[PDB]
Structure 1
Amino acid sequence: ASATRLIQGLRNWASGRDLQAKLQLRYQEISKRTQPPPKLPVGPSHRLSNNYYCARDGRREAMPPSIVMSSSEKKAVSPAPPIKRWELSQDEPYL
Structure 2
Amino acid sequence: ASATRLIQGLRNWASGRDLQAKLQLRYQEISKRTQPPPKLPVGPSHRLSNNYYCARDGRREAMPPSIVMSSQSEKKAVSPAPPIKRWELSQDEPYL
Same fold (TM over 0.5): yes
Instruction: Map Cα deviations across residues 28-78 of structure 1 (whole Å, 9 max, x no partner).
Output: 122223211111010202211111100111110010011021223241100
Count of matched residue positions in the alignment of Structure 1 and Structure 2: 95
Kindly state the Cα deviation for residue 8 of structure 1 after the two structures are TM-superposed.
0.9
Please, which runs of 5 or more residues in structure 2 have no aligned partner? none
Please, which runs of 5 or more residues in structure 1 have no aligned partner? none
How high is the TM-score relative to the length of structure 2?
0.89
1:60 match: secondary structure: coil
How high is the TM-score relative to the length of structure 1?
0.90
- Match of residue 44 from structure 2: 44
Kindly state the Cα deviation for residue 90 of structure 1 after the two structures are TM-superposed.
1.2
Q: Which moved more, 1:68-77 or 1:82-91?
A: 68-77
2:22 and 2:64 map into 1 onto residues whose CA distance is 58
2:95 and 2:16 map into 1 onto residues whose CA distance is 25
1:85 and 1:26 map into 2 onto residues whose CA distance is 45
Identical-residue share of aligned pairs (%) = 100
Deviant stretches of 4+, over 3 Å: none
- In the TM superposition, 1:4-23 aligns within 5 A as 4-23=4-23
